[PDB]
C-alpha cells in the first residue's frame, strides 16, 4: 500500500486544488473526489484482504471477476 | 403488451439466447431491445452471425453501426459498461435483464441492474446466496411474480433435475452420484496459463480436466426432498459443445433396466414432453447439436444392479438447450408478470 | 536361460511394450527376439523411434534392414504373416508370444501361435471364452505355470480392479457401477466411416462416443467374489492417450470420503505399492502420460453419500501403464515357467 | 429419359454426393438407383442420416432393410462386393458409376465396372494413367461423349485450377507454387499406425502432417498450357473438413493486389459464377462448411511483390464443394449422353 | 560475472525460458533471481512443474511458499504487480529483465523497468518503434552494449530469417512470400468470444484461422538488404505448439532443389550450427517438440520451378526453440555487458 | 425361393410407404400386414457380406473392437 498511499496523497492534493479552484460543487471536483475515494476504498479492500493472508493474485481476481484468470463457470 | 429485454454479457449463452429468440420471435411476449457487453456493436453483430458452433445465421440479415445491431430491420441498441449501475436501463425502459456475464450471480451484484432501472433479472447461472432457482419442467410453476432476481441454474442441473424428478417419483431416490463428461467452456485457458483454479489453468483442448461442481447438489434446490442427497463432479473434455451426464442412484423400489427406460420414455411423452427426450439410437455427441430438450436419455446405456442401483445416461447441448430453457423461463415470467 | 519373446502385432501396445522392455532391459528375464506385424521392418522401426505420444526414443539407436529391427545393436528378426499358424516360432525358439493384434483373443485364435511352436501366449486384451485372466497386483500370483494362454485383461480393468480390491476388503462392495472417460483408440474411425459398431463408426476426434464394455464385469474374473456385481460403460473423448475411471459402489460398512481415501493411501504404500498411486494434487490427463501405476487415485474427487454410496476417480495411462503391466505379467511368467 | 447411377464406395464423397443429389433431385437428369460398399445397407443408411460434419439429414426419412436403403420412399438397391467385376450393373440397368472407393483409379480398375455392365465411370479422384480429367468451369466443355472413363480430379485441383485459369488469362502465369493447408482425410491414421506414407502414418488429429500432392501438376492436365509449370505440397492439420490453398506465382504482366482481386471478383460474377466465390469477409474454416463454390477467394489475404510475384489464398469445402462438382460433371455427361 | 535476471510475465515464453535456463544452469552467466506475474508463487511453481506441452519437469525439484519458487533449492523471489514502475528491481539488484508479458513491447512500456531499477530489458517479441531487433545467428553480433532495450523478434521471424540469410548469400533473394502454418497461441479464444481481431475471436481448436503478420517483413530489420522485399501471412491451426514456415522466393542465380538443400545443409554444419537443423527424415510436428534449433529445414519438401522460383519448408518449436534463442541473446548480452 | 422374392418386394413396399406416410398411418399398417402374411409361409417351408468380411478381416478398420 506504500505505493498506493503515494497515489492517495497525489490524488488528495489534486482533489483539493481542483475543488478550491473549480468549485466545491462542480464536475471536476466530484470526479477528483471520486478518484481519491475509490483509491481509499481499495486501500481498505487491499488491507482487509492482507489480514486474510490473501495473495495479491486473489485480490486481482476479486477486482476482476471477468478476467480469463478468474472465471469459474459451474458447468 | 411485450416485455423489454436487455442482455448483459453477449457471450456464448447471451448469443445463443438471442438466436433462440429470433427463431421463436413470432410467438413471444419478449422484445429484445438492448445489449450490454465488453465489445462494440460491429464485433457483436459479426459473432452473432458467424458462429463456429451454430453456423451462419440465415433467417434474417444482421448489420450494425456505431450504436446498434440490426437483425432483419429490428434494432437492438448496444452499450459497453462493465459496471451495471451505469447501464441505461432507465432510458431504454428495460423490464427484464438476462444476466449472462457470469459475474453478477449474487443478489448484491445482480441487483445493480435494478438500481439502473430494470424490474427483474434472470441469471443464466446458479445464484450465490438465497436467490430463487428454477428449472423449467421441474419447478418453474412455483415462480412468484414478486421475485425480482431469479436463477435458471446451471446447464448440468437442467439436464439432471428432470431425470431425477422422474426416477424419484417412480422409484424413490435415496442417494445419487453424478459425473458430467462436459465440453470445455470459456472459463478454461486455451493453453496452460494463470488461473485461480489449477485445473482450469490447463490447456482445455489437450486435456481431460476434472472440476468440482455444485450442479448435483443444486438439484436439491428444485427438488427439496432430495436436498443433501445428491453430489457429483465434472470432467471437461476436448469437445467445444454438447455434454453428457452419468447418474447412478440408489433407489427404494427394486427395478430393472427395461423398467427404468419405460418410465423415462412415458414421462417424455407426457409430463416432460419437450424437456426430456427418449432415444434408443446409437448416436454420438455431434448428433445432439441444436437439440431443444434439456435431457436426451441414451436408453441403450441404462443399467441396474441388484434391483436398487440404477445408472442412466443423458445428453444435453449445454449452450443451445440451456438457452432454450432461459427463454422458456423468461416467457413464463412475462406471462406471469407482476 | 532367457525367455525368448515375439510380439505379434506391432501397434500402440506392441510398440509401447517394446519401449517398456528396452527401458527395463537391464533387469529382465525376457529377450525380445522377434516381431510379426502387417508392416515391414523399416516402417515399424520408424514408428518405434518416432511416437507422437511417447516422443523420440532416446536410449538406444534404432535401425532396420529388410529382415530386422535393431535397437542398440540388439537385433529383432521380423516377419509379416497375417496367419499365426505360418509363423517361424519353432525355428526362432520363441517361448512367449505377446498377442497384441487385437485379433487372436480366443483360445482357438491364440492357440495358432502354439501350433506354430511357441510355448505360451499372453493376450493384451480380455480373452474370449474361458481364458485365465490376470491383473498384476490383484491376482497375478495365482498364475499357474501350466496355463499356456492367458489374458492381461483390458486397460480399464487394470485400473479399476486394484481399487475395487482395496475397497471391497475394507468396506465390502455389494454392487458397483463404472464409467470410464477414455482416450480414443485405434478401433474408432477418423472420420465417419463403415464400422460394425455404429458408434465406433463416428469421427473419433470430433465426438464423445459411448461404447459398451466388459471391463467392469471382467473385474469379477480377477476378484471372483464380485462376479455379477459390477457393470459399466465407456465414453471415448478426443484425447489420444490417458483415461480416467469413475466408480460408484454400494458398500456394507458405513464410511466417509476421508476414510475411503485413507484406505487407498495405505494400500498404495503397502499391498498395492507400484500398482495404485495416491495423489492429492490437482492434475489433468496430460500429467499422467508415462505414469507407471495401473491406477492413480485422484483423492480430491472422492465423495460419499449416506455412509454407504462411494465414488472414487482414478487416472491411468491406457497405453504405457498397461504395457508396463504386460511387461510385469510376462516377467512373472518367466520366473514361474514350469 | 434419366441416367441411372450407381455409387461405388459410400464414404465421405459417396455420401456427400448422395446428399448433394437429394437436394438437387427435382432438377436432375440422374436417378441414383444403386450403391456398392463394404458396409451393409443398415450401416450405410445410419451414416447417410447421421453425419458429424453435415448434421442430421432433415429433408426426408431414411431407413434400410437387408437389401435397400430408402430415402423419402425412394429405394436404393445395395450390395457388398469388393470386386467390381462381380457387380450387378447389367441387372440393375446402371448407366454411370460414381467411383468413390479410392482404389479403382486406374483405367484397368475403373474398367471392371464396364465389364460388369455399366456404360461409363466417373472417378472421384485423379486418374492413374490415360484418363481424361475434367474440372467443371475450367475444361468440362471439352468432354467427349465417346469417353467411358473420366476423372473429376481432386478437391485441391478443383479449388486451384479455376483461380489459375483466371490469373493466367489476366496476367500470364510463368511458374506457380502451391501449399494446401488441408483438413485430414480418411487416408490418414487416428493414432500412429502403419501406412505406405510414413507421415500419413502419424496421429492425424495431433499433428501437422506434410504430404506430397499431384494436385498442382494436375492443374496442368486441365490447363494444358501450364503443364510442367506448377508444383506444391499439402500440410494436413487437425480439422475434419474445409481446407485452404495458398498459391504463389510468377506472372508476366505486372500488377498489384487490388487489381488481382478485381480480376477474380469480375470473373466470379461472370465467367466463373458458381465456381469461384469472391469474399471480402474475415472468416475462418468453420464458416465455409457447406459452401457450394469450388474456390472462395479470401481477398484480404492477396498480396503482390515487385509487380510479378502474386500470392492468393482460397478456401474450399473439400468434401461438399467437391461433391457438388462431381454432380455437376455427372449432370453434364447426362446432358451430352451419346 | 553473473548477471541478475528477472522475468516479467511467467507465461508460455516465461516458463519455457525458465526451464531452458534451468537445464543450462551449469554453463550460464545468468542468474534468475526474480519473477513478476499475475499469479502467486504457489500457482506459478505448479504451472512450471506441470506443463501440458513440456511434461513434468524432471531435472530439479520445484517447490514454493508464499514468497518464492525454489528450483533445485535455488530461491526465486516472486511479486505480483501489474505496473512495472512499482517492481522491486533496485532492491533485488536486477540487471536484466526478460519482458514476456506481451504488454510492454514499446519503449514507453519497457522503460518502466528501467525507472524501477533494472539496467536492461529484453523483449520476447517484436519491439514497437525504434527498438533494436536481433535474431541470433543472423545479426546478433551487431548488438551494441550501450543499448538499454532490445527485442528478440517473433518466433516466426527467428525461423525464417536464418534460412533467408543462407539462401540470400548463395542465390540472391529478389523477393519472397511466406505462409506460416502455426500452432494456436494464448492470443486466440477457446470458443467464439470478443476480440479486436475478428478472426482470433473464433474458437482456436476448431478452425484454421488466417491472420496478417509482421514476421516476413521483420526479416528486413535483421537483414537490411531485404527490407521491403518479403511479405506473407499466418494460418493458425488446431495444434497447441510447433509451427512450420513455407517460403517461396524469387532468386537471381538459377538453381535446383538438390543444390538448395546442399547449401542449407552446409550452413547447418558450419556457421549456422544450432540455428538451422537440416532434416531428410519424414517427420511430423509432434517430432519437433523441444527441438533447440530456430529452423529445421524439411529437405524432402524443397522444390524449384523454372530455376528461379524456390520453395523451402522449415519447422520450428515456437515456444521452446524461441525461448532457447531468448536465452542465447541474454547470454550474448551478459558476455558483452556494458 | 420364389416366395422370398415376394417378401423382398413387400418389405420394400412397407419401407417406402411407412417412410412417406408415417409409421402410424393406415397405409403403413396395410403394408406391414401384407409383409407378415407372406412371412407366415416362411414357417411353412444368415451372415451378411459385411459380417463375413469382418470374419475374414478382423484387423480391418471396419471391424476392430477394442474393449477399452
Ligand atoms: N457455455 C455454457 O455451456 C453455459 C451453460 C449454462 C450456463 N452458463 C453460464 O452462463 C454464464 C456465461 O457463460 P458463457 O459460456 O456465455 O461465457 P462467455 O465468456 O462466452 O460469455 C461472457 C460474456 O460476458 C461478457 N462480460 C464479462 N464481464 C462483463 C461485464 N462486467 N459487463 C458486461 N459484459 C461482460 C464477456 O465479454 C462475454 O462476452 C456463465 O455464468 C456460465 O456458467 C454457461
Ligand atoms: N491402445 C490401448 O490403450 C490399449 C490398452 C490395453 C489393451 N489394448 C488392447 O490391445 C490390443 C491392441 O490394441 P492397439 O491399440 O495396440 O491396436 P493397434 O491397431 O495400434 O495395433 C494392432 C497391430 O496389430 C497389427 N495386426 C493386425 N492384424 C494382424 C495379424 N493378423 N497379424 C499380425 N499383425 C496384425 C496391426 O497392423 C497393428 O500394427 C487390442 O486388443 C486392444 O483392445 C489396447
Ligand atoms: N474426402 C475428400 O476430401 C475427398 C475429396 C475429393 C476426392 N476424394 C477422393 O474420393 C475417394 C474416396 O475418398 P473418401 O474421403 O470418400 O474416403 P472414404 O474412406 O470415406 O470412402 C471410401 C469408401 O469406399 C469403401 N470401399 C473401400 N474399398 C472398397 C471396395 N473394394 N469395394 C467397394 N467399396 C470399397 C470404403 O469402405 C468407404 O466406404 C478417394 O479417391 C479420394 O481421394 C476425397
Ligand atoms: N507463445 C509463442 O509461441 C510465442 C513465441 C514467441 C514470442 N511470443 C511472445 O511472448 C510474449 C508472451 O507470450 P506468451 O505466449 O507467453 O503469452 P502468455 O499469455 O502465455 O504469457 C503472458 C504472461 O504474463 C502475465 N501478465 C500479463 N500482464 C501482466 C502484467 N501487467 N504484469 C505482469 N505479468 C503479466 C500473464 O498472466 C501470463 O502469465 C508475447 O509478447 C508473445 O507475442 C510468444
DSSP per position, D131-197: --B--TTTTGGG--TT-SEEE---HHHHHHHHHHHHHHHHH-EEEEEEEEEEE--TTS-SSS---SS
CB E43 within 8 A of CB E85: no
Number of helices (H), then strands (E), in chain A: 3, 0
* Residue position matching grid coordinates 486473489: A58
Comparing CB atoms, the residue among D285, D298, D305 nearest residue E177 is: D305
Q: Would the CA dihedral through F20, F25, F30, F32 be positive or negative? A: positive
Q: Do D52 and B289 touch (CB under 8 A)?
A: no
User: Domain locations in chain F?
Assistant: 1-68
CB C312 within 8 A of CB C167: yes
C-alpha cell at E147: 543499448
- What secondary structure letter does DSSP report for C266? H
For chain C, say whether B54 makes contact (Cβ under 8 Å).
no
Q: Do A56 and E66 touch (CB under 8 A)?
A: no
Separation CA D44–CA F63 (nearest Å): 15
Length of chain F, please?
Answer: 68
Give all strands of the β-sheet with C75-79 in edge-to-edge order: C62-64, C68-71, C75-79, C30-36, C3-8, C96-99, C120-123, C149-151
C-alpha cell at E313: 519448408
- What secondary structure letter does DSSP report for D26? G
Cα-based angle D283, D289, D294 (whole degrees, multiple of 5)? 90
Decide whether any atom of ligand 3 lies within 6 Å of the D126 Cβ.
Answer: no
Separation CA C101–CA C99 (nearest Å): 6
What SS3 class is residue D64?
strand
Separation CA C151–CA C99 (nearest Å): 9
Reported structure resolution in angstroms: 2.1
Gap from CA of C102 to ligand 2 centroid (Å): 5
**Sequence-distant (≥ 6) Cβ neighbours of residue B307 within 8 angstroms:** B254, B255, B256
The DSSP H or E segment spanning B76 is strand B74-79
What SS3 class is residue B95?
coil
CB B256 within 8 A of CB B170: no
- What secondary structure letter does DSSP report for B288? G
Which residues in E75-111 are b (16+ Cβ under 10 Å) and which e? ebbbbbbeebebbbbeebebbbbbbbbbebbebebbb
User: Domain locations in chain E?
Assistant: 1-153+319-338, 154-318
Separation CA C224–CA C219 (nearest Å): 8
Residue ranges of the binding site of C for NAD(+): 12-13, 37-38, 82, 124, 318
The chains in contact with chain B, meaning 3 or more Cβ pairs closer than 8 Å, are A, C, D, E
E strands within E163-242? 173-183, 209-212, 230-237
Neighbouring CB atoms inside 10 A of C223's CB total 21
The DSSP H or E segment spanning A40 is helix A27-50
Radius of gyration of chain D (CA): 20
* Closest alpha carbon to E15 in E58, E44, E55: E44
Give helix C12-23 / helix C41-49 axis angle, nearest 10°.
70
Following DSSP, what letter does each residue of E274-335 receive, concatenated?
TTEEEE-S---GGGGTT---SEEEEGGG-EEETTTEEEEEEEE-TTHHHHHHHHHHHHHHHH
* Residue position matching grid coordinates 508479458: E101
Following DSSP, what letter does each residue of D279-295 receive, concatenated?
E-S---GGGGTT---SE
The DSSP H or E segment spanning C98 is strand C96-99
The contacts found for E276-283 with CB under 8 angstroms, 24 or more apart, are E276/E137, E276/E162, E276/E163, E276/E166, E276/E314, E279/E315, E282/C46, E282/D198, E282/D199, E283/C50, E283/D199, E283/E315
Among the listed residues C20, C78, C155, C159, the single catalytic one is: C155
C-alpha cell at B185: 467452456
Neighbouring CB atoms inside 10 A of B110's CB total 27
Neighbouring CB atoms inside 10 A of B26's CB total 6
Separation CA C333–CA C141 (nearest Å): 10
Q: Whose CA is nearest to atom 41 of ligand 2?
A: C102
CATH of domain E154-318: 3.30.360.10
Separation CA C38–CA C61 (nearest Å): 23
- Find, in chain F, the residue whose alpha carbon is nearest to that of C209: F68
C-alpha cell at B188: 478454461
Q: Name chain E contacts of A57, Cβ cutoff 8 Å.
A: 38-40, 43, 80
Decide whether any atom of ligand 3 lies within 6 Å of the D158 Cβ.
Answer: no
Separation CA B272–CA B165 (nearest Å): 10
Comparing CB atoms, the residue among C198, C235, C244 nearest residue B282 is: C198
Q: Which residues of B are catalytic?
A: 155
Decide whether any atom of ligand 1 lies within 6 Å of the B99 Cβ.
Answer: no
Separation CA E174–CA E171 (nearest Å): 9
Separation CA B96–CA B337 (nearest Å): 10
Following DSSP, what letter does each residue of C104-147 receive, concatenated?
--BHHHHHHHHHTT-SEEEESSPPBSS--B--TTTTGGG--TT-
- What secondary structure letter does DSSP report for C8? E
φ/ψ of E100, rounded to 5, equals: -125, 25
Query: Within its chain, how far is the Cα of C318 from the centroid?
Result: 6
Q: How far is CA E293 from CA E247, E278, E323, in A?
A: 18, 10, 10
Separation CA B198–CA E48 (nearest Å): 12
* Closest alpha carbon to E19 in E50, E64, E65: E50
C-alpha cell at C50: 518416432
Q: Name chain A contacts of E43, Cβ cutoff 8 Å.
A: 57
**Sequence-distant (≥ 6) Cβ neighbours of residue C304 within 8 angstroms:** C255, C256, C257, C260, C310, C311
Which residues in E20-38 are b (16+ Cβ under 10 Å) and which e? bbbbebeebebbbbbbbbb
Neighbouring CB atoms inside 10 A of E71's CB total 24
C-alpha cell at F4: 422370398
Strands B50-51 and B55-56: antiparallel
User: Among B194, B196, B201, B203, which residue has the most ligand 4 atoms within 8 Å of its CB, making it the best to mutate?
Assistant: B194
Q: Would the CA dihedral through E21, E22, E24, E27 be positive or negative? A: positive
What SS3 class is residue E175?
strand
Q: Would the CA dihedral through B105, B111, B112, B118 be positive or negative? A: positive
Separation CA B151–CA A75 (nearest Å): 14
**Sequence-distant (≥ 6) Cβ neighbours of residue D96 within 8 angstroms:** D3, D4, D5, D6, D30, D118, D119, D120, D121, D122, D330, D333, D334
Give the technique used to solve this structure.
Answer: X-ray
Gap from CA of C15 to ligand 1 centroid (Å): 45
Listed by number, the residues of chain E in 253-282 with a beta carbon closer than 8 Å to a beta carbon of chain B are none
- Find, in chain B, the residue whose alpha carbon is nearest to that of E189: B190
Name residue E184's beta-bridge partners. Answer: none
Gap from CA of B37 to ligand 1 centroid (Å): 10
Q: Whose CA is nearest to atom 31 of ligand 4?
A: E82
Amino acid at each position: 500500500m506504500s505505493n498506493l498511499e503515494k497515489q492517495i496523497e497525489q490524488a488528495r492534493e489534486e482533489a483539493h486544488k481542483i475543488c478550491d479552484t473549480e468549485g466545491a460543487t462542480s464536475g471536476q471536483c466530484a470526479a477528483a473526489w471520486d478518484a481519491l475515494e475509490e483509491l481509499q476504498a481499495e486501500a481498505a479492500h487491499q488491507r482487509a484482504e492482507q489480514q486474510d493472508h490473501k495473495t495479491s493474485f486473489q485480490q486481482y481476481c476479486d477486482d476482476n471477476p471477468d478476467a480469463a484468470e478468474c472465471r469459474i463457470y459451474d458447468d | 403488451s411485450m416485455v423489454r429485454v436487455a442482455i448483459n454479457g453477449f457471450g456464448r449463452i447471451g448469443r445463443n439466447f438471442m438466436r433462440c429468440w429470433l427463431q421463436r420471435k413470432a410467438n413471444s411476449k419478449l422484445e429484445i431491445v438492448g445489449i450490454n457487453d465488453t465489445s462494440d456493436p460491429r464485433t457483436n453483430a459479426h459473432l452473432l452471425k458467424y458462429d463456429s458452433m451454430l453456423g451462419i445465421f440465415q433467417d434474417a440479415e444482421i448489420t450494425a453501426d456505431d450504436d446498434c445491431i440490426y437483425a432483419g430491420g429490428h434494432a437492438v441498441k448496444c452499450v459497453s459498461d462493465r459496471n451495471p449501475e451505469n447501464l441505461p436501463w432507465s432510458a431504454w425502459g428495460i423490464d427484464l435483464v438476462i444476466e449472462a456475464t457470469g459475474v453478477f450471480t449474487s443478489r448484491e451484484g445482480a441487483s445493480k441492474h435494478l438500481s439502473a432501472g430494470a424490474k427483474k433479472v434472470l441469471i443464466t447461472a446458479p445464484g450465490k446466496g438465497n436467490i430463487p432457482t428454477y428449472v423449467v419442467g421441474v419447478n418453474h410453476h412455483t415462480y412468484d411474480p414478486s421475485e425480482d432476481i431469479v436463477s435458471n441454474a446451471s446447464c448440468t442441473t437442467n439436464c439432471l433435475a428432470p431425470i431425477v424428478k422422474v426416477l424419484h417419483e417412480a422409484f424413490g431416490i435415496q442417494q445419487g452420484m453424478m459425473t458430467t463428461t462436459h465440453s470445455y467452456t470459456g472459463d478454461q485457458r486455451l493453453l496452460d496459463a494463470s488461473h485461480r483454479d489449477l485445473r482450469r489453468a490447463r490447456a482445455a483442448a489437450m486435456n481431460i480436466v476434472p472440476t468440482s461442481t455444485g450442479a448435483a447438489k443444486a438439484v436439491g434446490l428444485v427438488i427439496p426432498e432430495l436436498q443433501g442427497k445428491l453430489n457429483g463432479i465434472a470432467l471437461r473434455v476436448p469437445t467445444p459443445n454438447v455434454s453428457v451426464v452419468d447418474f447412478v442412484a440408489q433407489v427404494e423400489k427394486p427395478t430393472i433396466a427395461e423398467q427404468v427406460n419405460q418410465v423415462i420414455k412415458e414421462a417424455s411423452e407426457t409430463t416432460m414432453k419437450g424437456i426430456i427426450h427418449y432415444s434408443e439410437l446409437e448416436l454420438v455427441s455431434s448428433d445432439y447439436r441444436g437439440h431443444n430438450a434439456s435431457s436426451i436419455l441414451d436408453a441403450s446405456l441404462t443399467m441396474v444392479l441388484g434391483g436398487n442401483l440404477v445408472k442412466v445416461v443423458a445428453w444435453y447441448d449445454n449452450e443451445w438447450g440451456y438457452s432454450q430453457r432461459v427463454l422458456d423461463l423468461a416467457e413464463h415470467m412475462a406471462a406471469h408478470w407482476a
